[PDB]
Ligand binder design. Structure first.
Ligand SMILES: [Mg+2]
Ligand SMILES: [Mg+2]
Lengths: 101, 132, 173, 120, 138
């Protein structure tokens, strides 16, 4: 079990987005190019908008990995701010400490 | 009032480990880090991995040695091997202790795909820093 | 397994292989020491032959690569306990520690035989200066005292008149 | 030969003691592959198909079949140049990209001819 | 008293090849707490003096990374908690080394790396000239 249904959704999304990365890239090559004619690019356009909607990366969310919180995340530990503090304050995060200066 | 990772003052009878008697603002000042690994240093990678690994180890160890864990775990990571070091109450017969040592070390070695060492230090009763 | 005097054809075999270039295994030498022991109890000359065969065997560094080899270092030392000869036990030990000591003894029972007998020799045959010394090294560290090694320390302190080491050996025992 | 294997096992059984030291633990572990090799080289374990830098940098060979003067040369020389700078991919994979393009352009001849440039 | 006899069996071979020369070899140790880096420095220097490796040691400026999070679970934005991670450095600069010596010294040093520290090894190696450049011209 992932902690939340939402997290589940996200796992799927990352899987699909991993699978179609090659197709998406190859097509958006054509799409993003001035050199090729527009007639290729409109077909290529429908091509990439044909692809399953959950395969596109912008639909991914970086979520807290233990607690599933959608924001207030620190990218480095993939941790919610709350869970991060909870680990660091027991000193289970090496080299992390309160800051005085 | 800050509450984080604190053990509040009771009527004055409460036994408190050296660890538990020091609030987060004392980390790196008086008490030290319960883990050691390269990941949180300036130019380094995979901090996240090691954090999750850590969390799972504390949970796992706490469940594998029920009731006999004295203080929180110490996790040293060196050049791809993790030495877990624990303070253990004497509860079990040394048969059960060695069984669990071997069982654990093998299990976790196959889980995390790296050599795992386990070092048990045995103690009569929870070492007491304060009150009591 | 048949004749105790069938060591003479076997001895011939022991020379035979030495002609064709193949270095005799520790298993070979073991069986040699087995029949040579069965004929060592009544006659002490075959003893001298085991001791000299061993004496040539011990100037060398081993490669214990054949199947049966454990009982060699079992019975190579086993003879010195019955015949009470310590020098050749020093030699068996110098042999053990040489090539790979660890690889030269197969089992824990057959391991404690070794120290039972060897320390049996060390205690009565040698000065207290040597016995007290190898005591603290062998006993708690490697393999633990049986009854046979227990009685030996008792008879070692009666003859040399040592009343100082009784509390120590008692607390250890 | 199963008997030779049981012989090597019976030999390795008398040979193998429980470790007498740390250095032994580390030695057996290293030979086993559990421990790391020192001094560390990060490229250890991965040779990348024994390829050499010219099977990476110069992709001209796979542009042999493609219209030589067209805008397709422009586009494909860009794709090519991109793959030339790409560390994370193998030779095989780059070539698979190239071929997907071969196949996709050769899939649509129609749109290319109609486009105002005759394209091969 | 009890001494194992004939305990040594090193295995070394000499290939005919011209072992690689290292003009300079820099080793950067990052760690969290200073004291460990000092002990490590002591050990490293000592280890090099015994191999006659002729090294210098200096200390690169420390980096402190700070960041903030909210102090409360729900809503007081006015209150925060700030965390640090301090990275401290030592630099071991070795000069005029050989290939084998480098591999040994580095093996020894790297094995003994304490758990809270990291290491970066910059080897500048000496090569004379490539073949096709020597003195041909096309
Ligand atoms: Mg829920
Ligand atoms: Mg987003």
């Amino acid at each position: 079990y992932y902690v939340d249904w939402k997290m589940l959704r996200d796992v799927k999304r990352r899987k699909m987005a991993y699978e179609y990365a090659d197709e998406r890239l190859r097509i958006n090559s054509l799409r993003k190019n001035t050199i090729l004619p527009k007639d290729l690019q409109e077909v290529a356009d429908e091509e990439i908008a044909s692809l399953p909607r959950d395969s596109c990366p912008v639909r991914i969310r970086n979520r807290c990995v233990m607690t599933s919180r959608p924001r207030g995340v620190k990218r480095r530990w993939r941790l919610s701010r709350i869970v991060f503090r909870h680990l660091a304050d027991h000193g289970q995060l090496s080299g992390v400490q309160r800051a005085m200066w | 009032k800050n509450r984080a990772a604190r053990v509040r003052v009771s009527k004055g009878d409460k036994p408190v480990t050296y660890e538990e008697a020091h609030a987060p603002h004392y980390i790196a000042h008086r008490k030290g880090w319960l883990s050691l690994h390269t990941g949180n240093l300036d130019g380094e990678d995979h901090a996240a991995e090691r954090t999750v690994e850590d969390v799972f180890l504390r949970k796992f160890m706490l469940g594998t040695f029920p009731g006999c864990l004295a203080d929180q775990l110490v996790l040293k990571r060196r050049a791809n091997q993790l030495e877990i070091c624990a303070l253990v109450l004497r509860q079990l017969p040394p048969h059960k202790f060695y069984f669990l040592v071997g069982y654990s070390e093998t299990l976790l070695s196959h889980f995390y795909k790296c050599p795992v060492h386990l070092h048990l230090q045995t103690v009569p009763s929870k070492v007491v820093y304060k009150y009591i | 397994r048949f004749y105790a005097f069938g060591k003479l054809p076997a001895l011939q075999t022991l020379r035979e292989m030495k002609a064709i270039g193949i270095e005799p295994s520790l298993a070979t030498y073991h069986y040699v020491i087995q029949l040579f022991y069965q004929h060592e109890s009544p006659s002490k000359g075959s003893s001298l032959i085991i001791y000299d065969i061993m004496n040539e065997v011990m100037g060398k560094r081993f490669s214990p690569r054949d199947p049966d080899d454990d009982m060699f270092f079992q019975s190579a030392m086993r003879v010195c306990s019955s015949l009470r000869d310590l020098e050749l036990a020093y030699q068996v030990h110098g042999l053990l520690n040489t090539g790979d000591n660890w690889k030269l003894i197969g089992s824990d029972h057959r391991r404690n035989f070794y120290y039972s007998k060897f320390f049996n020799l060390l205690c009565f045959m040698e000065q207290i200066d040597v016995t007290l010394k190898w005591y603290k090294d062998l006993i708690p560290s490697v393999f633990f005292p049986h009854s046979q090694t227990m009685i030996d320390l008792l008879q070692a302190l009666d003859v040399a008149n040592r009343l100082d080491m009784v509390p120590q050996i008692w607390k250890d025992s | 030969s199963l008997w030779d294997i049981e012989f090597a096992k019976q030999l390795a059984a008398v040979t193998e003691r429980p470790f007498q030291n740390g250095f032994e633990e580390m030695i057996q572990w290293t030979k086993e592959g559990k421990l790391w090799e020192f001094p560390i080289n990060n490229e250890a374990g991965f040779d990348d198909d024994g390829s050499e830098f010219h099977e990476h940098i110069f992709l001209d060979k796979y542009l042999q079949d493609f219209p030589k003067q067209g805008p397709i040369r422009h586009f494909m020389e860009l794709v090519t140049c991109g793959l030339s700078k790409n560390p994370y991919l193998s030779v095989k994979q780059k070539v698979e990209h190239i071929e997907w393009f071969r196949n996709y352009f050769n899939e649509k001849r129609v749109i290319l001819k109609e486009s105002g440039i005759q394209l091969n | 008293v009890d001494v194992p006899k004939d305990m040594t069996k090193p295995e070394i071979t000499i290939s005919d090849e011209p072992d690689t020369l290292y003009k300079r070899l820099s080793v950067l140790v990052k760690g969290h707490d200073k004291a460990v880096l000092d002990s490590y420095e002591y050990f490293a220097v000592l280890a090099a003096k015994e191999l006659g490796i002729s090294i210098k040691v200096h200390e690169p400026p420390r980096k402190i990374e700070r960041f903030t999070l909210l102090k409360s679970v729900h809503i007081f934005k006015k209150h925060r908690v700030q965390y640090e991670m301090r990275t401290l450095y030592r630099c071991l600069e070795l000069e005029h080394l050989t290939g084998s010596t480098a591999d040994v010294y580095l093996e020894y040093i790297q094995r003994n790396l304490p758990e809270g520290v990291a290491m970066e090894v910059t080897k500048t190696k000496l090569e004379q000239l490539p073949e096709h450049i020597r003195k041909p011209i096309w």
